């Protein structure tokens, strides 16, 4: 029985299946769990919505193309509109959570191509215009994929998204130090990374701080031949885990 290629993940009213996985990466060896009485600082009772928050949210999926350079999403911000997680994040000064990230991409024995799927903590990105500063709308489109550029330039306060430097002044080939998997179309149809709350402080504001960035970068370009299905998307579905919130007031932004 039990082929290790087959997997079923259930969280809240959500189940994802896969019949071609390559194990699952638990970020830095640590499974997500709630903030403990020793490590706590905000004295108020936390609200823990469990199944209502901690469930599988499918974000707007992107199309993989032969020349398409790459994509990033920012968490928790990508989830700012995803159901009751978004609401809780909107009505609370502080929030804390880990996440099951599940990237999906299927093609065929006859297709080829390989993408890096990585969760980078504190991926603080550089301004394209080195002289100037970057700004939110060029840092995150919430649940919509921000694209990496093959082109070394961009519009006013856009990030320097030139792929080989991963938007942050380093070698993209070294991104592998962060919790990652690869969807190599020969081998698998999905990636799964279970990311713990990685931060220097027990809870933080859900909007101000992008705790980590999901980067999907094609290291080997998507390819196939003579009339063999052009459209092949990449879908990212993510589930919050052990989510708890402190400091409640009115609807929040400013």
Partner 1 sequence: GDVQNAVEGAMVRVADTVQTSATNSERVPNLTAVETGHTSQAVPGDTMQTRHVINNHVRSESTIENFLARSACVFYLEYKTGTKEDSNSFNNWVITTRRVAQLRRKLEMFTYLRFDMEITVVITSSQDQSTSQNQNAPVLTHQIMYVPPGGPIPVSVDDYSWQTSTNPSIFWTEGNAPARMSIPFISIGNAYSNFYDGWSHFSQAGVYGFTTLNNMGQLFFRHVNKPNPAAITSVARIYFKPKHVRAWVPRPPRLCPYINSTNVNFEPKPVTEVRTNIITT
Partner 2 sequence: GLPTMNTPGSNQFLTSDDFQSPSAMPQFDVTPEMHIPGEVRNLMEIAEVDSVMPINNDSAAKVSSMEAYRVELSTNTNAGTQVFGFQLNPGAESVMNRTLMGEILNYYAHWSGSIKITFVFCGSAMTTGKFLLSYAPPGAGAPKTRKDAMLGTHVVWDVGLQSSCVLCIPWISQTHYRFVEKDPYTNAGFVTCWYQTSVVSPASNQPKCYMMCMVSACNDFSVRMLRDTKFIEQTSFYQ
Partner 3 sequence: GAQVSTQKTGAHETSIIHYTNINYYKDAASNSANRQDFTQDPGKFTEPMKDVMIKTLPALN
Q: Catalog residues that contact partner 3 under the rule CB under 8 A.
A: 1-6, 22-30, 177, 179, 187, 194
Within 13 Å, how many C-alpha atoms sit on residue 3's CB side?
Answer: 7
Residue 201 interacting with partner 1 (CB under 8 A): yes
Of the residues 66, 201, 223, 228, which one makes contact with partner 2 according to CB under 8 A: 201
Distances (CA, A) of 228 to 105, 222, 232: 16, 12, 11
Q: Are strands 190-195 and 7-10 parallel, antiparallel or unpaired?
A: unpaired
Of the residues 42, 144, 198, 248, which one makes contact with partner 1 according to CB under 8 A: 198
Nearer to partner 3, 109 or 208 (CB): 109
Q: Report which of 238, 234, 237 is spatially closest to residue 107, judged by C-alpha positions.
A: 234
The item of partner 2, partner 1, partner 3, none sharing an interface with residue 91, based on CB under 5 to 8 Å by kind, is partner 2
The item of partner 3, partner 1, partner 2, none sharing an interface with residue 217, based on CB under 5 to 8 Å by kind, is none
Q: Report which of 52, 186, 32, 181 is spatially closest to residue 116, judged by C-alpha positions.
A: 181
Phi, psi of 178 (to 5 degrees): -85, 155
Nearer to partner 2, 35 or 214 (CB): 35
To partner 3, the closest distance from the beta carbon of 243 in angstroms equals 20
Residue 205 interacting with partner 2 (CB under 8 A): yes
Q: Transcribe 175-210 into DSSP letters.
A: GGGSSEEEEETTT-SEEEEEE----SSSSB-TTT--
The item of partner 1, partner 3, partner 2, none sharing an interface with residue 126, based on CB under 5 to 8 Å by kind, is partner 1
Q: Are 189 and 103 in contact (CB under 8 A)?
A: no
Distances (CA, A) of 15 to 19, 28, 84: 13, 24, 18
Residue 237 interacting with partner 1 (CB under 8 A): no
Residue 125 interacting with partner 1 (CB under 8 A): yes
Residue with tokens 């939110």: 136
Residue 38 interacting with partner 1 (CB under 8 A): no
Give the Cα-Cα-Cα angle 144, 21, 223 (nearest 5 degrees).
65
144-183 footprint of partner 1 as x/- string (CB under 8 A): --------x-------x-x-xx--xxxxxxxx-xxxxxxx
Residue 217 interacting with partner 1 (CB under 8 A): no
Of the residues 63, 66, 187, 230, which one makes contact with partner 1 according to CB under 8 A: 187
20-49 footprint of partner 2 as x/- string (CB under 8 A): ---------------------xxxx-----
Q: Report the site for partner 2 in 97-156 (rule: CB under 8 A).
A: none
Phi-psi category of residue 253: left, alpha or beta, with phi > 0 → left and psi -120 to 50 → alpha: alpha
């Amino acid at each position: 029985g039990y082929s290790d290629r087959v997997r079923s993940i259930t969280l809240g009213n959500s189940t994802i299946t896969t019949q071609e996985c390559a194990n699952v990466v638990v970020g830095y060896g640590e499974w997500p769990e709630y903030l403990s009485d020793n490590e706590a600082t905000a004295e108020d009772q936390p609200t823990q919505p469990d199944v209502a928050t901690c469930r599988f949210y499918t974000l707007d999926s992107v199309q993989w193309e032969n020349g398409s350079p790459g994509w990033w999403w920012k968490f928790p911000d990508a989830l700012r509109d995803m159901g009751l997680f978004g609401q809780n994040m909107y009505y609370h000064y502080l929030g804390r959570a880990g996440y099951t990230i599940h990237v999906q991409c299927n093609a065929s024995k006859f297709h080829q191509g390989c993408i890096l799927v990585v969760c980078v903590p504190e991926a603080e990105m550089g301004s394209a215009q080195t002289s100037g500063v970057v700004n939110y709308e060029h840092i995150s489109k919430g649940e919509i994929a921000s694209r990496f550029t093959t082109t070394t330039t961009a519009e006013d306060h856009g990030v320097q998204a030139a792929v080989w430097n991963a938007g942050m002044g380093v070698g993209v080939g070294n991104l592998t130090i962060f919790p990652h998997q690869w969807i190599n179309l020969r081998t698998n149809n999905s990636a799964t990374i279970v990311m713990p709350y990685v931060n220097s402080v027990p809870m933080d504001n859900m909007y101000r701080h992008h705790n980590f960035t999901l980067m999907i970068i094609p290291f080997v370009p998507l390819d196939f031949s003579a009339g063999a299905s052009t459209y092949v998307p990449i879908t990212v579905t993510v589930a919050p885990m052990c989510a708890e919130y402190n400091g409640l007031r009115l609807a929040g932004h400013q």
